[PDB]
Design a protein around this ligand. Sequence first.
Ligand code: HEM
Length: 388
Amino acid sequence: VHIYPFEGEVDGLEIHPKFAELRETDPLARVRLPYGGEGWMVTRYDDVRAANSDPRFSRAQIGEDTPRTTPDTILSLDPPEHTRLRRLLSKAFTARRMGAMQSWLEELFAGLLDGVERTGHPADIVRDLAQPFTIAVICRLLGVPYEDRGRFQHWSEVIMSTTAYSKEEAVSADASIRAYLADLVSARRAAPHDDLLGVLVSARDDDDRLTEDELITFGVTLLVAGHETSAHQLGNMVYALLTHEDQLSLLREQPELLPRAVEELLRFVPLGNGVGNARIALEDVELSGGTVRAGEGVVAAAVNANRDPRAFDDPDRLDITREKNPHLAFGHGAHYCLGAQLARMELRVAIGGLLERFPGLRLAVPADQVEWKTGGLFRGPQRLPIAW
Ligand code: HEM
């Protein structure tokens, strides 16, 4: 039985070597997390994929003996509840609605870059570009006006940063978010609005509709899934580019690589801490390393699947030219990221915008001077200074 956390802490974007060791010699690894009883950890692409997408695993029926690192959401529902929720949400999250945002993303990011450029280097990628970009996008989806972007950014930070804010602070922020969303929903029930939240309020599946509680809870989910995830992923992707100079140079010389570079950076860059939420088997499931019986918990992180040499050639080397890229960074199957198209657009706009504005873009300090976050759900730099 392997104890998590593993011995030795990782710096920056490094992947703990134990996962690779387990992938080759212990593909159905018995593990003991800080809380709950023993579970299984899977690290091979096929197994991780199965764990996170096969309908024989449940996200809803977690319990006390469920392995976990800690003592409502669509992310935690199973079919058929999940299926109903997802059908309604997909009336708003459409390719047509997301794709029509392209121009507005470009102008939003260009304004943020102008301000950075006016102020002069060094700037902080995290505070000056990534965070304000992604919160603005989610505020547009929710109908939150420009003047309240800062308020949402702050409230999101509070409920997300579980080690930096107290339970009482998180309760207060959540209450504030929900009160604001309740007012937005109430306005959207009085007359149709065309923002994504107004479209969700108007969405119908025969007679079925989202309740006020489901709408409000989904607004909260959108701050964590859409803003916080995107902001951290973007900062980490920029760090990775700025520390892989040959790859960054290649992207400048060959800008048509940008879409593949974004997919490769999604595959490569770690976001969380390598465990993920347990899934519980509703029924026996044969995986590569053996059989998971009904009732047993399985942890499976996409980051480990995305380094499996069974699925990617030379997986521990960043290669932005990779054409075949079936990474699991947005998941797979029923829970597949509802915002993937928009996330991809965001990452292309930001990275493409950054490289075009700043040919001389570089870290403003050596990498050993970047301080990395230590608690909470996300890896990321505390501050990421750049110069140009
Ligand atoms: C770089 C950005 C992003 C990454 C890496 C990311 C990744 C993910 C992942 C891994 C999942 C879970 C897949 C699973 O559990 O099987 C997910 C779910 C989700 N994402 Fe994202 N996401 C990103 C951006 C966004 C954005 C911009 C939005 C909305 C505008 C969004 C909305 C969602 C929603 C609603 C779900 C839940 C879907 C469900 O449970 O059925 N995401 N995302």
